[PDB]
Amino acid sequence: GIDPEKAKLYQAPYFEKSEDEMNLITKLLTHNVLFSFLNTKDIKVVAGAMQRATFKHDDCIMEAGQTTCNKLYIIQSGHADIIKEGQKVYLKTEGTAVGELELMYDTPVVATVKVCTDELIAWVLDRDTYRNLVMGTAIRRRETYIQFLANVPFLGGLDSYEKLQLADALSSEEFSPGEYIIHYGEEGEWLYIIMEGTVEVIGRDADGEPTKVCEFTQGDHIGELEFLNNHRTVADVVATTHVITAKLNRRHFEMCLGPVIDVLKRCADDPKYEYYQNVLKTGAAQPSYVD
Ligand SMILES: N#Cc1cn([C@@H]2O[C@H](CO)[C@@H](O)[C@H]2O)c2nc[nH]c(=O)c12
Ligand SMILES: N#Cc1cn([C@@H]2O[C@H](CO)[C@@H](O)[C@H]2O)c2nc[nH]c(=O)c12
């Protein structure tokens, strides 16, 4: 990819944006996994470089085999089918991207992208800005996680593409024994998948004192309950050994884990979550919403 010392000398194009346009576009970017590790300044540079395009039902945004696209489209509204060898294989919806496979891996269009709503509105980024300012360590990050994610039970229903979309939004964090991964009573912004080690979940008894609920270990996840039910954290999660986690921000939860939300909701039937069911029944938490 692009030499990082040279990427610093790249100036993206700027197409003047109103404040309202900037707000709209940056919200799309901050919830799309391709931009997960860009800072605010760089998000806004990328937004400034984008241009709007619209399409109608049955238009092809790109067609398998084309070498003349080389653009990244982030969907504001509308849906499109991904068509391989005449078969619909995936549905792209609002906030998602098309064209990233070709830009990341430098190949002609792999699949046809065909609009299936009445209209579709997208924001479009050029290849050079994507390669110089966005792509970064995307391939290395995917290498860091894909083999692990292929072995995680709750992700078994995701295909390779979807597992890699999750990987795009992950970073790693390690904890020594006794360090708190999650504290009770906080906004609850982070979901952790345990790559190694064991944790304990600590609730509160009727007198308000800490009480151990259960343990989790490699392959398990913590932090999803607040994301599902929009409340502040209701337990501490503490490392009981050295722990290595993969970490996902709440802003990427819908895009990355949307397809497994019904799997995550199965915790209601798991005896390890009896304590939480009582939290919900008695209303023992206050709200917290995604930013
Ligand atoms: N092969 C393939 C796929 C291509 N795409 C998309 O189509 C655009 C044009 O190929 C890509 O830049 C993606 O955005 C896929 N999306 C979900 N699952 C898939 O398997 C594929
Ligand atoms: N109340 C409660 C519980 C909380 N958690 C976890 O702690 C994180 C922070 O609350 C959650 O996002 C879960 O990951 C629980 N895990 C198992 N059983 C439980 O009853 C609870």
From TrEMBL:
Domain Cyclic nucleotide-binding: 34-151, 154-266
One GO MF term attached to the UniProt entry: protein kinase A catalytic subunit binding
GO cellular component, one term: cytosol
Protein name (record): Protein kinase A regulatory subunit, putative
Organism: Trypanosoma cruzi (strain CL Brener)
